[PDB]
């Protein structure tokens, strides 16, 4: 029955033409009246050391003072940002780790990697040591990103074209999101925690409703794999970083690509993308051994962070948006301000 | 200028750092080997002689070996490959009794051909620019039995030689070893396994000892 292929062509063309009709102007033309941010200088107010291998993940705590970092050595380290003191040093059962998560309440942490298992550790145990609270299994690929929702709910993304919403007490997959045609590499929850976004290794991003479990929108435009996704603080837009050495800004309600950020002197893709609290700044981490601070409203480049020796592996910004913690494969975590 | 509790926190942090450094020193004296193959090309048997990631820890002549098998992870080699960098060696198992065999997929494709392209992709990867390969050639006996009936020319329509096991095996080795385009930094310690004795681990031990000597000489700055 070849008719279904023609039908798919028909709806695809209808969607594309409706999208083209909807657009009337460009964000650059509308924004070409405001004063540019200028030139941002940031200094490493603190350097955190103690890892003996590459750093593969990092998540800021609920406050602006605690954070958690994972290394391929096989260690999860909890750092007190203000005084560089180490609060906890959890040894993992598998050294192949590619993700991290910090619970909003601060009671639990999450870990995962090539073992296809999401391990949830309890931080505040009355005995006085960190224990493995739970071990969730059911994925058939490497875990790429896990983010907490409540103290009793997590969302994971695997490399088998599948995202999942779990239930910590029962340990069962409450909901499964499928539809991607490649490995999912990033995940970002909405500020209201009612929906999220996933970027897969087929140059596509998808919008997911947590409770319903069905996709709502899909955005294309990239020409390579997608390595990182960040959500705008407004909750109605997001940013994608790809291996095409190009960032893009998508909007949900309009369902369009607003701006593209790229330069002729950049040839390596982005590995981590994160907005600022005001939304006027976008920080990206390349393989050029440095991080770059663009201007999300004018599509120019403002700042650079070149403290790390090797390339920027993971990047995040404080909840109040003053410090920027960036960890790299050369076993260093720099706190810029 | 420090409170009573803050000094105790600093003491705890220093103890944590001490433990981390001790763990790092203790975990840096084990030889790590990656394992790769094409299908069920004798990999299970090779592991027997000596989900996801499968780690096997064993000991030979006071040397501790950790071997990582990634057979389960089918999705995308490129994304997880960079995790294994700085490994002491890469074992590559090739079943050479498959010249007359094709995939379960009904694509006319002889098993070593995809093995050849997999070897080419792995050998010339930018991560493994100075990592030695310990290529093993398996199923020697079955190949020897089959070569009398079905000639090797069905796989290689260029070979001009007798249907004898020795020279056919030499041809296969020669056409599996030319793909190394980086002959200046890395080595290919080929071996004809499946002899069913305690000799594969000996070959691996010799290769890793040579790699250890080279790494020590590079570290000392004398070489």
């Amino acid at each position, epitope marked *: 029955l070849d008719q279904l292929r023609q039908e798919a062509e028909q709806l695809k063309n209808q969607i594309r033409d409706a999208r083209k009709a909807c657009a009337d102007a460009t964000l650059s033309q509308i924004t070409n009246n405001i004063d540019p941010v200028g030139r941002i200088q940031m200094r490493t107010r603190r350097t955190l050391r103690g890892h003996l291998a590459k750093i593969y993940a990092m998540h800021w705590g609920t406050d602006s*003072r605690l954070l958690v970092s994972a290394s391929q050595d096989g260690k999860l380290i909890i750092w*007190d940002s203000y005084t560089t003191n180490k609060v906890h040093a959890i040894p993992l059962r598998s050294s192949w780790v590619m993700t991290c998560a910090y619970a909003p309440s601060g009671n639990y942490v999450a870990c995962g990697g090539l073992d296809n298992i999401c391990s949830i550790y309890n931080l505040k145990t*009355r*005995e*006085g040591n960190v224990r493995v609270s739970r071990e969730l299994a059911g994925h058939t690929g490497y875990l790429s990103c896990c983010r907490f929702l409540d103290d009793n709910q997590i969302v994971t993304s695997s490399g088998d074209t599948t995202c999942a919403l779990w239930d910590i007490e029962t340990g069962q997959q409450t909901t499964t999101f499928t539809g991607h045609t490649g490995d999912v590499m990033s995940l970002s929850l909405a500020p209201d925690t009612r929906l999220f976004v996933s970027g897969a290794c087929d140059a596509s991003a998808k919008l997911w409703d947590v409770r319903e479990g069905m996709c709502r929108q899909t955005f294309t435009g990239h020409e390579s794999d997608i390595n990182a996704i960040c959500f705008f603080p407004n909750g109605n837009a997001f940013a994608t970083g790809s291996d095409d050495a190009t960032c893009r800004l998508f909007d949900l309600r309009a369902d369009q690509e607003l701006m593209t950020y790229s330069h002729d002197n950049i040839i390596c893709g982005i590995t981590s993308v994160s907005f600022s609290k005001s939304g006027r700044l976008l920080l990206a981490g390349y393989d050029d051994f440095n991080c770059n601070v663009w201007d999300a409203l004018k599509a120019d480049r403002a700042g650079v962070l070149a403290g790390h020796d090797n390339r920027v592996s993971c990047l995040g910004v404080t909840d109040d948006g003053m410090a920027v913690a960036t960890g790299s494969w050369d076993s260093f975590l720099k706190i810029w301000n | 200028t420090l*409170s*009573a*509790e803050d000094k105790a*926190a600093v003491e705890r942090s220093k103890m944590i750092d001490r433990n981390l450094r001790e763990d790092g020193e203790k975990a840096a004296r084990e030889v790590k080997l990656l394992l790769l193959g094409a299908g069920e090309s004798g990999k299970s048997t090779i592991v027997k002689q000596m989900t996801g990631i499968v780690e096997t820890h064993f000991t030979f002549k006071d040397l501790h070996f950790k071997m990582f098998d990634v057979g389960a992870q089918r999705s995308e080699r490129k994304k997880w490959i960079h995790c294994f960098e700085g490994v002491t060696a890469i074992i590559f198992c090739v079943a050479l009794s498959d010249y007359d065999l094709v995939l379960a997929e009904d694509e006319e494709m002889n098993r070593m051909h995809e093995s050849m392209k997999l070897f080419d992709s792995i050998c010339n990867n930018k991560w493994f620019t100075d990592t030695s390969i310990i290529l093993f050639l398996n199923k020697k006996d079955l190949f020897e039995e089959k070569i009398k009936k079905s000639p090797l020319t069905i796989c290689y329509p260029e070979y001009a030689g007798s249907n004898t096991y020795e020279e056919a095996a030499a041809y296969i080795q020669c056409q599996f070893e030319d793909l190394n385009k980086r002959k200046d930094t890395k080595e290919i310690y080929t071996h004809f396994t499946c002899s069913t004795d305690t000799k594969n681990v000996q070959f691996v031990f010799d290769a890793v000892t040579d790699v250890i000597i080279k790494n020590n000489l590079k570290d000392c700055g004398l070489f």
Partner: single-chain antibody
Amino acid sequence: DVQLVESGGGLVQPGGSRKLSCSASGFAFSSFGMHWVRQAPEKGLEWVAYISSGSGTIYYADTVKGRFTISRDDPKNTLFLQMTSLRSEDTAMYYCVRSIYYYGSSPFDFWGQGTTLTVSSSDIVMTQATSSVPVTPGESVSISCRSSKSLLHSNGNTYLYWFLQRPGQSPQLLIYRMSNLASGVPDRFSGSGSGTAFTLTISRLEAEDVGVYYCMQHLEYPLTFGAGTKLEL
């Protein structure tokens, strides 16, 4: 199942020596600092000694400094107190207290059962003027403690602790850092105040809250206690 059991007490002739043993069970003893505290038969609590994790830091009270000794044995997770040349003022009840220090931790959370010893015959000072207050069930109660020095540090922390001791029971931690409640404590307790003047309030008073309340100065390792406020009838 995290009880601590202490032994070594008894009637002692003056000038003798003794060993006090605190045996632990059910927690990571190697990561907890340990304190030996003393309570007179009719007076309040008094700090005696402190040992850190790894035995890298040991502190003694000025009244017994150079006379007693402390030690810990991690593999059998047992705390030892060497007591020598006992005077007539060393008859008391000894408590073995655990405390772990990191960001957001709660020191002095758990207290031992206490062992009795009878013998035959600058520093911040914390005062509690209110000796006793008559309270009927169902009221709101206030307890005021005062200091001789500012307990507020430059980092914002105010090191003041509030403990409760029921009749014939070991002391229990109520409030740590003057504002944070301990685990398992009902929400009806609260604490506030500023430097040199702190106040603990209890709402909807119940039959259980009968006991003696003590304030605690943790800014210095002398760890001066208060006189204690009694609530009865």
